Design a binder for these strands. Structure first.
Ligand SMILES: O=C(O)c1ccc(P(c2ccccc2)c2ccccc2)cc1
Ligand SMILES: [Au+]
Ligand SMILES: [Mg+2]
Ligand SMILES: [Mg+2]
Ligand SMILES: [Mg+2]
Ligand SMILES: [Mg+2]
Lengths: 106, 95, 82, 98, 95, 106, 98, 87
DNA sequence: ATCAATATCCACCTGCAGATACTACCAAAAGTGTATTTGGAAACTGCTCCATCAAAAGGCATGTTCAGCTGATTCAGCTGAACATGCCTTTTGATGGAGCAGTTTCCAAATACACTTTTGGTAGTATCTGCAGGTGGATATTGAT
DNA sequence: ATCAATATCCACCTGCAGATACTACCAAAAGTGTATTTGGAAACTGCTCCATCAAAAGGCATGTTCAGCTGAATCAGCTGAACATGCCTTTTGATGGAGCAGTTTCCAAATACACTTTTGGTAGTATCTGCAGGTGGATATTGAT
């Protein structure tokens, strides 16, 4: 017995994704490729975020990813920020950003 | 007692491929779970609409692909599409 | 020394929120304006949360009730389930 | 003693609160306000601890965001001081009312 | 030539009840049709979600009712809920 | 043979609403009350809109409701306006509204 | 030779257009612009005429709505003249470019 | 057989007067000379985004013809639901 | 400028709150073998969609003129920022019990399936009626004086 | 205020597009009637985790002081409104041709379904450690002079 994940070359669970598609009332039927494709897409986006969040941890002299790092990764990347524009990361805070006109003159 | 499923096993496995010496807090992992479930729902939702608009009873990888194009910004979409197509190829070419 | 619950959202706490929002200087009328806005936000989200509670025949508002409420109000929150 | 000029500590607090992620409203008063408001929709309610926390994360992130747009509205009018009309304009354009 | 169905018939009946001497342009009818399809999907979608959230496989008038309280504002909800409760109570007692 | 609309007291089509609920993949099952309740809510809302639009027609000395009358009805009612706040009514136009500072004199 | 003062005809035009519902962009040019943009995404496309009309109704309703918000941004700045910075502020607060 | 003439610069068909008119409907009394190019740019972005989604639905359905329904669904996705053209 | 006050940065240290690791079931994936279901591949329609040609008006481009709006400048007065601390509200941590969640049961209510009946959406022709767009012509509104 | 230019209003009036009216009508629904299956309400209760509260904690209410921001007022320049004038491009309405949406009928391939193995994934349990705060001392920033 081989898993569909291992056949597809994936860490994300093809079988589970299939079931979650069946029992979510998305359609009467589900093609065999669909859970594979979907699982790979979700794995890909997960890798992308964990890549940039890891880097943000590294930059702050840390080996454990926290929500702050996820927030920094997401909001400093133009594409992830757009994808997640209507989403709040709990315990994320905001990007350091001060409007120019508020900086002291002399 | 009852089982409470999540994606955390898999997020952690992908974390290790991407940063082998980096760990993740519990809270961070909750956020990553929320992330997977959210994008799952958006892609599945769009795929469902696509099938319904074309009077089809079936969501195939073609609906997942079009949904990805509709939902992801440019570069993310391209790579997601290429990762998805690759996984379906590998899965088929596998006795 | 009795006090309204809304007033427990204090000038300095509203000021810290503003500061995280990058605000340098703050009119004295902001504190009451902000309390009004916060109350509306809580009303709208709590209403929907409780409506989920009542539907599940529960007496306890769950994190999930709040998460689903936030989602339909266009304020998706990651990290508390779902 | 010694006395900082108006705005110098304000800037300092901006830098400090933008670096961090702790909640900025005290928990008990927030929790009371939640229960009070909830009481109008159903009596004798209990709340999971994580339910109240999710609420406080959401309100604070909303209010911070609103203060950013509010600040943009003040600056648009050549001020550096936020006012009720800035908050009202930001809400109007967002479509939260009017 | 295939049957393209719409709510026109019923919109018109309801028009005649409220304003006996008033007509409606076909463009106005197009809009009224979009409005009904739109509100159907929103209510049905909230009901679907709500059932899933509670691990139910059945959408009953209780799911519709709650979806209506989530979707409609104040007075429209109140009145809508009354008309729907009353349509069911009547429907139940008429077999 | 009575229709389920006639049983329920309804101009709106109960059978049709039941069927659209089945084909839309909202749930495995559909309760018998569900399409009755939903067809009624739909009927209520359309009655509400037509009443107000009928009035806007009459106010503009017209007998035929056009899209402008629907837009005036919706936009002049606080609740319908909120329900439909992210919708565009084709050939609707806007409400007459001039900001005060723009008027002449003092 | 008779002249209305600056603003008088502008106000008359506001009353006139706010009263009517007809499309304000000329049809053929709008149709050419649709065909040009779509062609750059995909060659050899055709359009149902109602498709083009649906786009024009959407684009006009979006622009009218944007000018209302823009006008509020100008007035907030104590002006009566809309400027590019008003449109940009409206778009930023709307989350079209937030 | 026939071809298609090259389509170029059609954004300029959104003329200064058409833009004035839209502003009027939107309540605007006075208009800076820079508004017209800024509006053309905002319009182009908005059209590209809707057409992109509509054409994607067309291609998914394996048609060569963009229907009203494709535009309607693209507008809905974009949070700009339109009544009056089906659906 | 110099010089003091205080904020800020960095190296190092360390206990424990919170990770990662391990174990051991077992629900749920995968394997197997039929039982439906579907989405085309071909093979035709009748659409609309595209193209194009001609006439005409209705709106567009342009240049001129100057009204009044914007943005610079100056300034006075008000209004929010900064400030020290003990009062008191919040935080922390310990303990009954409310009620969520686990589990089992069973029938009112759901799907399924094969008839029978009816309605809603067409399309063919026919009639009708509301109102768009044109006409004066009696009633404002605006701006010069 | 009074007067003259011109936009606005309103109401009556004929052509006609778009609306309502049948007619007939049939194909697809919707309804009716058993046969069959089951989702979830109901009832009991185990054990989280929630409200309460006592002692421990540390943030905020307060009133004064004055720096510097906001809003008022003035005004010179120049931008953007109004309008006259010349005419290009859109609108309207034909006509033909065909590219292509939209159906329908047969199956080969694909997906569902009932039944059995065979794990991967979770809860509960057991070790392991990253880093939150703490201190100590150097250095930068700010503001007074
Ligand atoms: O999209 C934004 O985030 C955005 C932010 C600010 C502005 P305003 C603006 C005015 C003064 C200071 C800073 C900003 C602006 C833009 C262009 C020219 C002149 C003023 C516009 C957009
Ligand atoms: Au601005
Ligand atoms: Mg009536
Ligand atoms: Mg008329
Ligand atoms: Mg000047
Ligand atoms: Mg440290």
């Amino acid at each position: 017995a081989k898993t569909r994940s291992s056949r597809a070359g994936l860490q994300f669970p093809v079988g589970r994704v299939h079931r979650l598609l069946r029992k979510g009332n998305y359609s009467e039927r589900v093609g065999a490729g669909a859970p594979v494709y979907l699982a790979a897409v979700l794995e890909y986006l997960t890798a992308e975020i964990l890549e940039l969040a890891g880097n943000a941890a590294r930059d702050n002299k840390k080996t454990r990813i926290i929500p702050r790092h996820l927030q920094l990764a997401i909001r400093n990347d133009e594409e992830l920020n757009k994808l997640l524009g209507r989403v709040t990361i709990a315990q994320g805070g905001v990007l350091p950003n001060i409007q120019a006109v508020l900086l002291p003159k002399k | 007692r009852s089982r409470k499923e999540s994606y955390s096993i898999y997020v952690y496995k992908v974390l290790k491929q991407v940063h082998p010496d980096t760990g993740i807090s519990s809270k961070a992992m909750g956020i990553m779970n929320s992330f997977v479930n959210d994008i799952f729902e958006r892609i599945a939702g769009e795929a469902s609409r696509l099938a319904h608009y074309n009077k089809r009873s079936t969501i195939t990888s073609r609906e997942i692909q079009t949904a990805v194009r509709l939902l992801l910004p440019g570069e993310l979409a391209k790579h997601a599409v290429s990762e998805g197509t690759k996984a379906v190829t590998k899965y088929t070419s596998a006795k | 020394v009795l006090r309204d619950n809304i007033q427990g959202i204090t000038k300095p706490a509203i000021r810290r929120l503003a500061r995280r929002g990058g605000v340098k200087r703050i009119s004295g009328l902001i504190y009451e304006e902000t309390r009004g806005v916060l109350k509306v936000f809580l009303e709208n989200v709590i209403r929907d949360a409780v409506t989920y509670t009542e539907h599940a025949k529960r007496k306890t508002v769950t994190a999930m009730d709040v998460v689903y409420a936030l989602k339909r109000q266009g304020r998706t929150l990651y990290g508390f389930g779902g | 003693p010694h006395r900082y000029r108006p705005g110098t500590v304000a800037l300092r607090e901006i830098r400090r609160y933008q670096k961090s992620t702790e909640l900025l409203i005290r928990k008990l008063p927030f929790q009371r306000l939640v229960r009070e408001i909830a009481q109008d929709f159903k009596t004798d309610l209990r709340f999971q601890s994580s339910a109240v926390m999710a609420l406080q994360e959401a309100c604070e992130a909303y209010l911070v965001g609103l203060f950013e747009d509010t600040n943009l509205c003040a600056i648009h009018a050549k001020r550096v001081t936020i006012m009720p009309k800035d908050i009202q304009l930001a809400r109007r354009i967002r479509g939260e009312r009017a």
